[PDB]
């Protein structure tokens, strides 16, 4: 009944070791194509 | 698409100081100036100043440059594009003519020729400056197409404001709350009435809930 809490060590998975150093990083891809509206028009020439 | 919620109304004596808060949500608090504007009966609406949550730069009008202190807290992120924040204004050397309604307001644009322009406003905070003490209200019942009207009378309270709800907020349709009266004694009084079908006497009980937070008094009156 939440009166006492017990903590034991373990090593269930080896990945937890990598997460200890990859918690701050993240991979994303750059999408450099953006389309926006402006008061510009192409010259028909 | 965010809401600014200001602290409740306060009654303070002249010469004292008061600190009003303005909690924000639904947008990036860091990206927009927070303006402070007040409205009094003697001077009308009056802009006091703004402050930038990002840089901390503040700009106060000369009339409040020596009596207003503006501060802001750091934003607590919720998502990548929204967060929650809080801005404060501390005004000192209060006078009787400083009694009025105070607003905080979010700026318009992050960049441009009018970035700080107050665009999103809070609900307002009523500040009363008086040497008189707080006084709780006295609530009296207002006795009652097949339609009828009943309500509750809030007599002799101070200061403003007083809030009235029905059935703990369950009854909102047909409610009509009237502005307060300013007696010659300096105390306020208002009335609230609700219109209901006359046949609904055997199925509906109407409870008016009066809250006067300045006196920290609640009254639940059965009509």
């Amino acid at each position: 009944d939440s009166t006492t809490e017990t903590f034991r060590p373990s090593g269930g998975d080896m990945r937890d070791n990598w997460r200890s150093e990859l918690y701050k990083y993240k991979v994303v891809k750059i999408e450099p194509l953006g389309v926006a509206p402006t008061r510009c028009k192409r010259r028909v020439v | 698409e965010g809401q600014l919620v200001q602290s409740g109304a306060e009654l303070k004596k002249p010469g004292a100081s008061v600190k009003i808060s303005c909690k924000t949500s639904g947008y990036r608090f860091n990206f927009y100036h927070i303006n402070w504007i007040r409205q009094t009966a003697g001077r009308g609406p009056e802009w006091m100043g703004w402050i930038s949550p990002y840089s901390g730069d503040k700009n106060l009008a000369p009339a409040f440059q020596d009596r207003v202190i503006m501060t802001t807290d750091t934003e607590v992120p919720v998502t990548s594009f929204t967060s929650t924040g809080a801005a404060y204004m501390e005004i000192r050397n209060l006078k009787f003519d400083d009694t009025g309604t105070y607003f905080c307001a979010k700026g318009l644009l992050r960049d441009g020729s009018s970035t700080w322009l107050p665009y999103l406003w809070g609900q307002g905070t009523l500040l009363t400056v008086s040497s008189a003490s707080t006084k709780g209200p006295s609530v009296f019942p207002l006795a009652p197409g097949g339609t009828a009207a009943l309500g509750c009378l809030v007599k002799d309270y101070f200061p403003e404001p007083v809030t009235v709800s029905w059935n703990s907020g369950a009854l909102t349709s047909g409610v009509h709350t009237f502005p307060a009266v300013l007696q010659s004694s300096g105390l306020y009084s208002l009335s609230s009435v609700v219109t209901v079908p006359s046949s609904s006497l055997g199925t509906q009980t109407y409870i008016c809930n009066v809250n006067h937070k300045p006196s920290n008094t609640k009254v639940d009156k059965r009509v």
Binding site: - | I37, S113, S114, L117, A143, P179, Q183
Partner: protein, 213 residues
């Protein structure tokens, strides 16, 4: 304030109306931008116009701005009942805060007439015990927004303890007001009836209570 607006302006229903905003050259026009705000009394305002012509997001195309070298103007087209309120202009630059105007109250003519609603409540038995006596006359849903209230003790005028509020605008763009008459329990019991008379230029309504019933 040094920024002056037209104190009052009127326009007809379905028509347009223009509000002016001018002042000295120190605080007016060139070298400055002008914004407009809708500010109903007792409620939070709404930004309609900033940087001259350019209207705030979601603002109806009925609103338009125009700035001359000496004064600025705000035009409201296709007038609605909700357009009847108070409006303020502001003069500002990028680094300098707002300078508010003197204010303008807009009246919309050509609106339908609204009959006054009058209700009079007597003092409660708990109130006669206090012992005081206050009659409450509540008025709502009248238009235009102007009333005059008179109290009578046994068909004869009263002048002691009369308090009447200013007219106030309802959420339905009609107006409301209230009046209170404070009395002593002897005056209340010593008369055959009391009356609240609400007078309007088109029709006068009378509501009467009596201590007997």
């Amino acid at each position: 304030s040094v920024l002056t607006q037209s104190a009052s302006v009127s326009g007809s229903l379905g028509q347009s109306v223009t509000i002016s905003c001018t002042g000295p050259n120190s605080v007016c026009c060139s070298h400055k931008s002008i914004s407009w705000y809708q500010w109903p009394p007792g409620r939070a305002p709404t930004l309609i116009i900033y940087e001259d012509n350019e209207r705030a997001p979601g603002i109806s195309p009925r609103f338009s701005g125009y700035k001359s070298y000496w004064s600025a103007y705000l035009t409201i087209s296709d007038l609605r009942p909700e357009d009847e309120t108070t409006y303020y202009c502001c003069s500002y630059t990028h680094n300098s805060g707002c300078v508010f105007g003197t204010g303008t109250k807009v009246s919309v003519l050509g609106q339908s007439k609204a009959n006054p609603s009058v209700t009079l409540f007597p003092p409660s038995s708990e109130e006669l015990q206090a012992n005081k006596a206050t009659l409450v006359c509540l008025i709502s849903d009248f238009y235009p927004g102007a009333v005059t209230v008179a109290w009578k003790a046994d068909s004869s005028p009263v002048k002691a303890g009369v308090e009447t509020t200013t007219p106030s605008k309802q959420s339905n763009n009609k107006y409301a007001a209230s009046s209170y008459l404070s009395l002593t329990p002897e005056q209340w019991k010593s008369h055959r009836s009391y009356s609240c008379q609400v007078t309007h230029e088109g029709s006068t309504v009378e509501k009467t209570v009596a201590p007997t019933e």
